[model samples]
Target: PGSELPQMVQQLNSPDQQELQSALWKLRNIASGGNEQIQAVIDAGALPALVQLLSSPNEQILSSALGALSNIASGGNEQIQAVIDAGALPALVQLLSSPNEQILQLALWALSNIASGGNEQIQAVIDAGALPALVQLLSSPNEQILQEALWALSNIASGGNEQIQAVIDAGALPALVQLLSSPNEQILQEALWALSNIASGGNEQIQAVIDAGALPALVQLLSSPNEQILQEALWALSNIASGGNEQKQAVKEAGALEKLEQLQSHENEKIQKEAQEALEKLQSH
Candidate 1:
């Protein structure tokens, strides 16, 4: 059988197929980039063919395949479940550990998309022992990896308290906190973005972040020179700090309150806004 999509995807490998490159990208867009092509791929039993593209030499082809997988995974309910049943997850997980950062990040994004469908796929990832590698990837200084790791953790954590606890146990929160403490604005924003999800993880989760010494570092961000950092950090603290009223009092007594009050008079409105907000909340306890 001459497969139009697969044939075109094959063309993505040829150096002379620059014209077909856009066509292949469009084909990928049609294939895994949306819902209509989702059932078509599953109907044609093309899961393995797409998974095979993960090994291709061209980064564009690899990215297209990843995007296709992500789109197929997004089909919601049955179509994505078929990908898992067809053994596509192994390919996805392989990409997770691949030396290719783009592949790894895109693969994670795909997994997160699949995991969003429900517990079956997420549990498949868990049973595949994907958790440890995810935490390891969180160590990547690249903001994209950090963002993807957060995406994976958020979905995995969404499964339940147990899943959230599993992520903490696998050594994720410490690394997340380390990123949160960094002076970089993008890293801090992404860190807080991830930390917000874990906020629902309850006291033990917050304790894990705090046990990593995140609370003080978070407090310190309230005074950062960057407005965005100050905002994300304060919101993160408020979320993590909301674990219990006692944690709030603990945060204040630990000198977080003093630091905020000291910053209240700062000339920066953004900084002053965050400081006032955080100190008011802290002093309330």
Candidate 2:
């Protein structure tokens, strides 16, 4: 069949720019399928070829290349490892500096998927210096870029104590707190998600969130009509309350206990339970 994988791979390697672009386009579509399809691209030796074009002066080619990488990373751990093994991290991180919003957005999505994979992959991105740039991205006027940065940070924070501490140590705590007041509900939710992970860490990490002046604002989110946001906020507050006595005292002082009491009777059983647990913990302290 003309649709053979080798024929597709040959087109990717073709000397004609048009043919190469066409092949990249086809590969991108192929990668959009499930794992078998993505792995097939990897098996067809697309990784190194894809990463090489990352520096292409042609924005279209660059965009297509990054799209392939992003799809591969989003596949699964093996696919993510394939992308990383192909040496895509540095170039992907480099794209963080691209003035092209689409490029930056896709790159952030790719990195976030890698972070979502596991600790080692998260560490790979961290080592590639994604933190400082990602924190800087929190200030981006572009909403999608800002949203992706927060999502990436939230994923990194969810890894564990070391990863969460890496996020906090990277000065993400202050940036994240500032995002809490954002009118965008997703932004608010992600900020709370990051804070929840930070609060779940050790006393020092929990105290970092506490000291970031997040309590009052998080307390405010308790009134959000969005159940997901409310649950995340309550979960964060609960984690804060579950921290050392000093941390619990901080949540109580922020007046979270009062709002939590109201939620104890909320329609959502999960929210009510979370609120009740937070209240009990705070009172016990």
Candidate 3:
């Protein structure tokens, strides 16, 4: 079954565009099978050829190549690093600007997968200057693009302090705050996830989230029926409460105390504990 792997990889370098596209499509399918197939494709030396196809003038080839790379990245960290080591980062970042929405989505997914790796992998995406392009996508009318960008940014923000700061510096806070009110539950969740990560940073970063007017929106989510949303909202608020007295006071003024009080006896033990802790943090000082 894996014997065709090398042939597919070789066809990725075919001078014939159709052959290249076909090979890319097949490689993507094979890589998507499972970790074993993914490793087989990687061992067959598919990464360099797949990455080179990223710059193909043909949109079909480019999208297929990205699909293959994204699937390869979906494997373990070693496989993801293999794609990155093959010099895919810069090209993927550039594809973020592709006028084709599908290309934009594929590129974002690939980057998001890479960012899901360790700190260095996340930093590689950021250093590729993906922030501004990603931040710009936050306002995209396309919900999928908006969600993909949010996921990528959230993954990046999950890194160290400077990485979180890099996201804020790229102007993600305002857009992220605005997303809290989004009617789409998935978008709302992603926004909260991103904000919670940002809020987990120090005072200045928490203040940045606060200054963007996220408090009221976050406070409102404490009443969400969805446990995940409620939990994320609680996490964001708790992090904000972790800030100095002034920030805690801001959370209090946003009307979170009553909701926190209500959540204390909720069915979910984790929520109950977190709500109690957050309330205590706010009440103090």
Instruction: Give each model's clash number.
Output: 1, 0, 0
How high is the CA lDDT of each candidate model? Answer: 0.72, 0.85, 0.88
CA lDDT, candidate 1, residue 110 = 86
Per residue, candidate 3 scores C-alpha lDDT tens digits across 39-92 of: 999999988888777888887878888888888888787877788789999998
Candidate 2 lDDT tens digits, 1-285? 435766777776677788888888888888889988888888888888888888888887888788878888878787888788889999988889999998898888888888888788888888889899999999988888898998888888878688888888899988888998888988888888888987888888899998889998889989989999889988888888888788888887888877988998899998988888887878654
Window of ten residues with lowest summed lDDT in model 1 = 17-26
Cα lDDT tens digits, model 1, 219-253, are: 77776778677677767776665667776766775
> What range of 10 consecutive residues in model 3 has the weakest lDDT sum?
1-10
Q: How accurate is candidate 3 locally (lDDT)?
A: 0.88
TM-score of each: 0.74, 0.92, 0.89
Q: Of the pair 2 and 3, which is ahead by lDDT? A: 3
Off by over 4 Å in 1: 1-27, 31-37, 55-62, 141-143, 256-285
